């Protein structure tokens, strides 16, 4: 009953027959900006189905020595579909996100991935006093990789990362993780090209292993923006 | 008693005993029943 | 005027005092509040979230390898697999956890703890383990026949991947202290040990060595007292850029 | 789900259990939820009316302490020439920094206490001036420049013989809360600083000795303490483990040897079956 | 007597404090109040009055020539006529205006601005212009096809001599700051540009170069915070006669 | 509370929120209607 | 503000003052109270318990031998057996008793005292004694004919092993003082003497020398005033380990 | 009057005049009557 799930948004839908319930970050659900919290006075555009739908990113391969992967939001989607177009033509944006991470193998494989949504995941650089640069942070649709997952690449720890909204993909138990993210920021809206509200991290705490036939085991990420709103229309910063 | 005209000047407010651990401990859409199998 | 007299303590600056003080910017209007997800009002809310114990804190285990305990198919019976020092004041597997980190900003504690273990082997792997909590007084048990006499849970691997061992608050005094003497009667919590109840059994194509991830958290009957500076952070020099803030 | 909690929860007595289909001790960590197994379901318990309080862990109390945020020594003599400027930040002293960084967002007013001490190179009872220079305002260039007339800036004049000066700075962010962490860049171009939200820019604290120099020199040290109050906090975070390296970022290196080394946070024990402080009788 | 104790802050002189203090002249009877025209109670009342922008702040333009923008009959189409830096903290066309001067005594601001332009050519001169406000994020537009995508007003010269371009408050945060870094995300307001929609067309006896005067003012949804000393005035010496006041 | 006998000794009076911008923004004898041509 | 002025005494530290003072640990929750046997609320409760008088404070008597008075079968009549100095300020048999020790933390006292003696000879031993309290004024009586004129109790040994002599509060002034001058009219309490009324008579196989143990306590009409440091304890050097507390 | 927020900061409490000497002077199970032989 809580192992099967279908998510439908816009012209897109996803089903899983091996889910583990699903997480609603901090027990919240996405919503449009109410009049009593609004700041920007221009009438916003709410494109609905053209932007609030699942966008599937390129997959990554789970290898025996993988350290983990990460994708920042909205950066990862800032150049995809109509969500990307609205982001480029508008100074301000606001939205929640429905995240669905996918990874299947066989009943002979073992492995466990921590799938966590980190708010304001400010990265640190290793063994230097120089702060991370633009290209170290903005990876776009391709996402990045963890250098030292043990400390979440920020001098803290993955051990305590469970304090953030998360799920796990334990091959023996499930083949997907689902997390619903509400707007998370100190402002009602923001400029999408210079700030990322959330960072999706997928880290193999227990490495992939088996003694059966070796096969490429991918990890795929599908993300659907929710309740998108845009303000401050102008030309595209394409 | 705050004798200053600006409320932000007042002493600390140590009376908010409200809590909701579940937003961190049980952020799952479907409530998990006591002894019933979670999956 | 009003006749008055100054008391001892007059003029002092106590870092934990609580008084109103002059507003620097009169008539300042702070930004309106906005609802933000995840508000936390009591630190006890944070320590109730389970986090990973660094059980494999051994030489040769690097980074994340220290966060999982590997168990193998045994050739002998009733084998001891691992134990967990319940040290919170002294460094150990429980120190870098949400409950451990926050508790270390305090001196006294009381309440039940819960350890949850998730089996991360393959679906075709089966097994039964016994997790035991031994109240203080003696030496850590090294045989199942002895450990089995304490508080425990026999765990059968299956659809439900995880098991919980409750470490109930069993203490003579209302609170225990995070005292530097680990063998003190007001600090030692006892031990946690894990033995094979049966054995880890897997088919030829499943890996024959599987990992467990152990988590720990406080229950809502927990309480912390006497705030102190945490021993987990310190500095001996100015941080880079600190002095430049004056230039 | 939300409720008023003033004491730790009580325990209810429990009996023997042998029910098919009921397994409270089994859980599924994969859901992301923490185990909901109660002590009463794991073992047989007695009834306990728990009176233990939970007020010392209230966020207001946890963060409600005056902590050192700035310390500056300078020479007071005939010529930092009798004054200094400090670009305000809460990242220079690690005890306060680590605690604030246990949260993602924080909204609070800040009580500021200024403590001054002097040493001869008797002690003069000097008068000092601490002026708050907001972003965009001009900072003093000399102990005697016109800037100190402080026509609009807030200034506080205090003597070394008086108790430490004190005042409260209101929550002044342009947003609804301060961003303790900021995964973004401060500017519209690509060369801006990463991890520094412009919105949380306070300004500069300019401090000078008002008195003209004496015939001899003195070393004056000014310590500034900050105590947050009327606090609201959101989204707790993993505590810092690696030593801090810079006030401008979360860069890390780790200690040379455990504990808190990049390769091992917890110190090593001989093996997973070795009990470190085992009781030997 | 009453037992008391002095708190930190005791004895200090905070320039923004607010307390009563001893009257120097007891029983003094101030002159009766009389009604006087033009009372102002909130500085926001002053910044709502439009004042002239110094748009032609270029070398070669002296005094009042800097307060008007000359437009000529064009030979080409869709021509860019001028742009206006929306810098208030940094020096620019908006700095010496009522809204600019008063706002600079503060650090934070929020609200809509309005720019009004009055065409001062002859009655026989006709034309259509397009005024555009471009929210921040990119480079200032240099072609009408690009500028036209932002907020704008197409202006037709006629009986009503002036047009108003509203620069609506469009910001992510509640307030913006008068930060010294003009490219900061918490300060940059965007751009204002002006292009010919058609062309300035005049008969032989009308001057072929006409002037526009641009004004700016805050709307009543405006708000300022965090008072500071203005960077617009300073002194390095005693003013003439200052010392003589002591002789 | 002012404990001095002369009222001018009292602390500041920051409670006058009355405004009338129109004496500066619209000092015209004939009120100008919203969208109606001013001239 | 409020006009005030400091009074003499301002800033002083009086060890007996009573004021509230800043809590070092805000929001600290003390351990819940639990019922504990033997709560004492007024020191007068303690001095009402009788304790042993060191009547045999003589050279040759060591340790516990000093706490019992031996009486023997007499050859002569009306023999004086022992007397008890009623000195509390000066060292004497009453000093190291519950009433004596606690009273010495004070300067003034008032109330009745009670002395109880338990005969500890064998069951076959018989006898009659007379215990006398002589109010002050003269020399201690040395003959029964004289002592007998004061307050007294004739004691017959038997089933009930103990007798009580009440030393009623008989004083001109409301209180007496623990003055260093034992012969002062505001301090001297008088004397207590014990004589054979008949004789101690025992059979051949019973010991011919028997012991008495004398106890003393205050009655509930007792009262103490003017607290002072007790002369019963002092130090001239650091105690062992005191300085090590700083290392 | 304690002006601090924590009650343990208050001045001394010198108003508890309750006593029960008998817990020390007569801890015997059977009450001893005035003049009646104790044994
Ligand atoms: C000493 C003035 C402090 C003003 C408030 C500073 C808040 C900083 C919050 C943070 O980013 O950690």
mmCIF file of N, CA and C and ligand atoms in Angstrom, chain D residues 88 90-91 100 108 112 169 178-180 202 226, ligand 1:
data_model
loop_
_atom_site.group_PDB
_atom_site.id
_atom_site.type_symbol
_atom_site.label_atom_id
_atom_site.label_comp_id
_atom_site.label_asym_id
_atom_site.label_seq_id
_atom_site.Cartn_x
_atom_site.Cartn_y
_atom_site.Cartn_z
ATOM 1 N N UNK D 88 31.796 44.266 10.791
ATOM 2 C CA UNK D 88 31.061 43.309 11.607
ATOM 3 C C UNK D 88 30.790 41.948 10.965
ATOM 4 N N UNK D 90 30.068 37.491 12.470
ATOM 5 C CA UNK D 90 29.960 36.575 13.604
ATOM 6 C C UNK D 90 30.680 35.264 13.316
ATOM 7 N N UNK D 91 31.694 35.319 12.457
ATOM 8 C CA UNK D 91 32.430 34.124 12.054
ATOM 9 C C UNK D 91 33.878 34.022 12.537
ATOM 10 N N UNK D 100 25.759 29.013 16.145
ATOM 11 C CA UNK D 100 24.871 29.661 15.187
ATOM 12 C C UNK D 100 24.709 28.774 13.948
ATOM 13 N N UNK D 108 16.724 37.315 15.061
ATOM 14 C CA UNK D 108 16.916 37.741 16.438
ATOM 15 C C UNK D 108 17.426 39.164 16.562
ATOM 16 N N UNK D 112 24.459 44.024 22.436
ATOM 17 C CA UNK D 112 25.896 44.218 22.285
ATOM 18 C C UNK D 112 26.510 44.813 23.553
ATOM 19 N N UNK D 169 20.905 45.949 19.152
ATOM 20 C CA UNK D 169 20.762 46.193 17.721
ATOM 21 C C UNK D 169 19.555 45.346 17.329
ATOM 22 N N UNK D 178 18.020 36.046 9.065
ATOM 23 C CA UNK D 178 19.407 36.065 8.610
ATOM 24 C C UNK D 178 19.696 34.701 7.986
ATOM 25 N N UNK D 179 20.550 34.675 6.968
ATOM 26 C CA UNK D 179 20.932 33.423 6.325
ATOM 27 C C UNK D 179 22.265 33.010 6.939
ATOM 28 N N UNK D 180 22.240 32.038 7.847
ATOM 29 C CA UNK D 180 23.475 31.589 8.481
ATOM 30 C C UNK D 180 24.380 30.980 7.407
ATOM 31 N N UNK D 202 25.750 44.050 7.926
ATOM 32 C CA UNK D 202 25.442 44.988 9.005
ATOM 33 C C UNK D 202 26.143 46.323 8.760
ATOM 34 N N UNK D 226 28.206 39.578 21.906
ATOM 35 C CA UNK D 226 26.877 39.629 21.326
ATOM 36 C C UNK D 226 25.992 38.550 21.920
HETATM 37 C C1 LIG I 1 27.448 42.226 16.259
HETATM 38 C C2 LIG I 1 26.271 42.536 15.332
HETATM 39 C C3 LIG I 1 25.590 41.234 14.906
HETATM 40 C C4 LIG I 1 24.393 41.562 14.010
HETATM 41 C C5 LIG I 1 23.641 40.283 13.638
HETATM 42 C C6 LIG I 1 24.547 39.373 12.806
HETATM 43 C C7 LIG I 1 23.780 38.110 12.410
HETATM 44 C C8 LIG I 1 24.718 37.165 11.658
HETATM 45 C C9 LIG I 1 23.986 35.855 11.352
HETATM 46 C C10 LIG I 1 24.930 34.918 10.596
HETATM 47 O O1 LIG I 1 24.945 35.017 9.350
HETATM 48 O O2 LIG I 1 25.591 34.107 11.280
#
